[PDB]
Enzyme design. Structure first.
Site, PDB file in Angstrom:
ATOM      1  CG  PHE A  52      -7.406  29.864 119.396  1.00 24.70           C
ATOM      2  CD1 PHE A  52      -9.385  29.576 118.323  1.00 24.70           C
ATOM      3  CD2 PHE A  52      -7.744  31.467 120.334  1.00 24.70           C
ATOM      4  CE1 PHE A  52     -10.125  31.115 118.870  1.00 24.70           C
ATOM      5  CE2 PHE A  52      -8.848  32.403 119.755  1.00 24.70           C
ATOM      6  CZ  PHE A  52      -9.462  32.474 118.750  1.00 24.70           C
ATOM      7  CD  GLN A  53      -1.052  33.328 119.244  1.00 23.43           C
ATOM      8  OE1 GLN A  53      -1.174  33.033 120.955  1.00 23.43           O
ATOM      9  NE2 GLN A  53      -1.535  33.362 118.094  1.00 23.43           N
ATOM     10  NE  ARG A  54      -2.714  24.712 112.614  1.00 22.06           N
ATOM     11  CZ  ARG A  54      -1.922  24.067 110.967  1.00 22.06           C
ATOM     12  NH1 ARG A  54      -0.470  23.698 111.355  1.00 22.06           N
ATOM     13  NH2 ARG A  54      -2.179  23.374 110.723  1.00 22.06           N
TER      14      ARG A  54
ATOM     15  CB  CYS B 225      -5.471  33.852 115.780  1.00 23.68           C
ATOM     16  SG  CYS B 225      -7.303  33.804 117.387  1.00 23.68           S
ATOM     17  CG  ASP B 226      -0.612  33.111 114.874  1.00 23.26           C
ATOM     18  OD1 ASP B 226      -0.909  34.163 115.552  1.00 23.26           O
ATOM     19  OD2 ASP B 226       0.556  32.054 115.351  1.00 23.26           O
TER      20      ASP B 226
ATOM     21  CB  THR C  69     -21.963  32.909 117.177  1.00 19.03           C
ATOM     22  OG1 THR C  69     -21.308  34.066 116.724  1.00 19.03           O
ATOM     23  CG2 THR C  69     -23.365  32.665 116.000  1.00 19.03           C
TER      24      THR C  69
ATOM     25  CG  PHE D  86     -17.949  33.596 112.624  1.00 21.10           C
ATOM     26  CD1 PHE D  86     -18.325  32.642 112.487  1.00 21.10           C
ATOM     27  CD2 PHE D  86     -18.764  34.255 111.485  1.00 21.10           C
ATOM     28  CE1 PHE D  86     -18.418  31.444 111.976  1.00 21.10           C
ATOM     29  CE2 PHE D  86     -19.218  33.880 110.568  1.00 21.10           C
ATOM     30  CZ  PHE D  86     -18.774  32.327 110.448  1.00 21.10           C
TER      31      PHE D  86
ATOM     32  CG  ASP E  17     -20.183  42.119 116.115  1.00 19.58           C
ATOM     33  OD1 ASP E  17     -20.074  40.802 115.884  1.00 19.58           O
ATOM     34  OD2 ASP E  17     -20.098  42.759 117.254  1.00 19.58           O
TER      35      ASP E  17
ATOM     36  CG  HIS F  96     -18.392  35.430 102.108  1.00 21.22           C
ATOM     37  ND1 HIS F  96     -18.780  36.167 103.497  1.00 21.22           N
ATOM     38  CD2 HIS F  96     -18.743  33.947 103.243  1.00 21.22           C
ATOM     39  CE1 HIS F  96     -18.970  35.991 104.359  1.00 21.22           C
ATOM     40  NE2 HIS F  96     -18.433  34.787 104.994  1.00 21.22           N
TER      41      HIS F  96
ATOM     42  CB  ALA G  84      -8.454  27.342 103.741  1.00 20.77           C
TER      43      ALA G  84
ATOM     44  CG  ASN H 168     -17.309  35.337 107.797  1.00 20.11           C
ATOM     45  OD1 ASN H 168     -17.859  35.845 107.879  1.00 20.11           O
ATOM     46  ND2 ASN H 168     -17.020  33.638 108.434  1.00 20.11           N
TER      47      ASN H 168
END
Lengths: 389, 389
Positions: free
Chosen positions: B56-58, B60-61, B197, B215, B217, B303, B308, B336
């Site tokens: 998850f860290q990767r 987010c980074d 979500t 994601f 808001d 969008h 990526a 997003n």
């Protein structure tokens, strides 16, 4: 360098949006209303609730529905006890049913409309799908594109969780899509399945119980387009003007929440009274500009939310009893199919008019009105012109 | 007696649908991305899942998001443990949040757009509301009519459960509503809240985990109309042509189901690869007819589903790095925001263009393109013309 005014002129259609085909479909399981009180109190394990059962019997006898078509069967209900209780966790099961049934049933109606239209399905440029029964991503619009083999570039409009006025909404939407785009041909599909709203009875929730007497399943499909090719395409009705409004003093009249126990249904106000008190305003707005004030001189399509709506509207306006014939015939044979109802009524009206040798598809009359009624309290109005023959 | 051709000519608008105002809003709680891995693994009780946390860290980074705005707080999450698990019954709680927050947040953006527009809110004839966060009857459209004091006869279009391409869908819809109806003024509101979500992490569901890194808001509102009153109304962008398509070989790329545990998110295919492989076809369809083939000569709004997607599109087409500046700036500051994203990007682009004294609202260029990407795999294309100054 580029002229946007030239592009805009070349891109738009010329004439009024016209309904060119109508096809309908329903689940095969036909449920008689006469024997429904016994069946329903037995499948929901509520035979001991005697006073409630008498109340339901009266609701069903006053419904003016002879039969309804329901995806849910006794076998499905026996595998889903949580759907048979008034309030148990059951959305996942209900979603599994309707994510598949809504597009399946919609496809059957759509194939019938496409066959009547007679033109290549590759000419369908826009697709409107409407349902109040479940939600998913990709939606039922993507499923129907796949099932029907529409072009992958069909322009889609996924109408979810709209409620009973949405037969009017899909017509209001199709009108603009067809009229603003040259060559556009819109497939419109309303597909409603009561597996998300079915639930057991409760004596403190008689409004919910009313829904169990009235809602039934079905799908209706249309082809809508401007500039019909003469003698190749066959106009049925033309749309001329539309409106949508919220009646005053109607806050909370009809509310429906999508919860862990499925879609609940509540009635906190007098819906027949509200509709009847506000229908004249809607008629004046639509017909004053056409110089029409005799509401027996136009053909009628009204969402049959319940028989009392129809009865009070007829009483309010002094409609001859026959004006609501096609509406009541659909109510009788299929019950309240939510958004699809009014589209079944257009089909009944043009078929009976043609069958009986009348001069137009609108019972021999030139101008007509279609109303949808639903949460908000919302009234949808569509002014129609019939077609000769 | 009555001429429908005269009615139709008198009823329709003349020019291209134009964006006349843009306003945005976000929940007050600003969540930094740098520290999100620690916060998220702590509020979801997953500190023991060490290898997952590194993953998850990767994510987010690599996200290219600095911060996001989230209705959910630590206090709300502490009162809702079922929302903090990967998969627990929690839709009722999540619905209670978003049924209120979506319209609240939408109202804030709408009031800003209406103020910029400067004309009476009673002139708003049509209302489009779009959200992928919760559903209800009456919908968020009725709630926003009430909150804003729009006329009860505003014509409403409730877009529920659409997904990330729907910023393009609401523009495609508004175009037809504005262009086919003389005097129409459409309020468009996209309001997205991730409370439906959000969920805890699971090592067998890394696709779901990606959603937690990306994601955020926010809500964006537009006023769209044809035939702007010169010097009273102020055009920002004009819409000229639209398309929607489903990419080949993309079945199941992005699926999201609304369940008893809320809205799930799954990724079964290479979304950046699919978008990149199909973006040229979309550009050729939109721009061949205008005689444009240099895709650096137009202004871009894409969008930002993830960085990526942007990176591969840029690589595929040989876009100069600056073309995606406004897109990436919104990704960086807000993450997003699903359907609202592209509308924040239009606002960023016209503000930076005006602020920096460029000749048009589209970075000094005349023609531009807006893309939405989402379930199906669906690509929405909107061709825009900028405005001088």
């Amino acid at each position: 360098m580029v002229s946007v005014s030239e592009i805009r002129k070349a891109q738009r259609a010329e004439g009024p949006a016209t309904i060119l085909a109508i096809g309908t479909a329903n689940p095969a399981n036909c449920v008689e209303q006469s024997t429904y009180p016994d069946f329903y109190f037995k499948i929901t394990n509520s035979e001991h609730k005697t006073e409630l059962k008498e109340k339901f019997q009266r609701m069903c006898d006053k419904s003016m529905i002879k039969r309804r078509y329901m995806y849910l069967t006794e076998e499905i209900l026996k595998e889903n006890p949580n759907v048979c209780e008034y309030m148990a966790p059951s959305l996942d099961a209900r979603q599994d049913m309707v994510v598949v049934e809504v597009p399946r049933l919609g496809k059957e109606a759509a194939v019938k409309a496409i066959k009547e239209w007679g033109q290549p399905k590759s000419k369908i440029t826009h697709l409107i799908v409407c349902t109040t029964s479940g939600v998913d991503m990709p939606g039922a619009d993507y499923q129907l594109t796949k099932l029907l083999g529409l072009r992958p570039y069909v322009k889609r409009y996924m109408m979810y969780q709209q409620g009973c006025f949405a037969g009017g909404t899909v017509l209001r939407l199709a009108k603009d899509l067809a009229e603003n785009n040259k060559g556009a041909r819109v497939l419109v599909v309303c597909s409603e399945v009561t597996a998300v709203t079915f639930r057991g009875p409760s004596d403190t929730h008689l409004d919910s119980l009313v829904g169990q007497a009235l809602f039934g399943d079905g799908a209706a499909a249309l082809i809508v387009g401007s500039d019909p090719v003469p003698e190749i395409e066959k106009p049925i009705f033309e749309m001329v003007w539309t409106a949508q409004t919220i009646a005053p003093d109607s806050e909370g009249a009809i509310d429906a929440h999508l919860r862990e126990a499925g879609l609940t249904f509540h009635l906190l106000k007098d819906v027949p009274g509200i509709v009847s008190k506000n229908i004249t305003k809607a008629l004046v707005e639509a017909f004053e500009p056409l110089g029409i004030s005799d509401y027996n001189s136009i053909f009628w399509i009204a969402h049959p939310g319940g028989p009392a709506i129809l009865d009070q509207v007829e009483q309010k306006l002094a409609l001859k009893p026959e004006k609501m014939n096609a509406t009541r015939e659909v109510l009788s044979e299929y019950g309240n199919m939510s958004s699809a109802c009014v589209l079944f009524i257009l089909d009944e009206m043009r078929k009976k008019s043609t069958q009986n040798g009348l001069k137009t598809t609108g019972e021999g009359l030139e101008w007509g009105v279609l109303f949808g009624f639903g949460p908000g309290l919302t009234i949808e109005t569509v002014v129609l012109r019939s077609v000769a023959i």
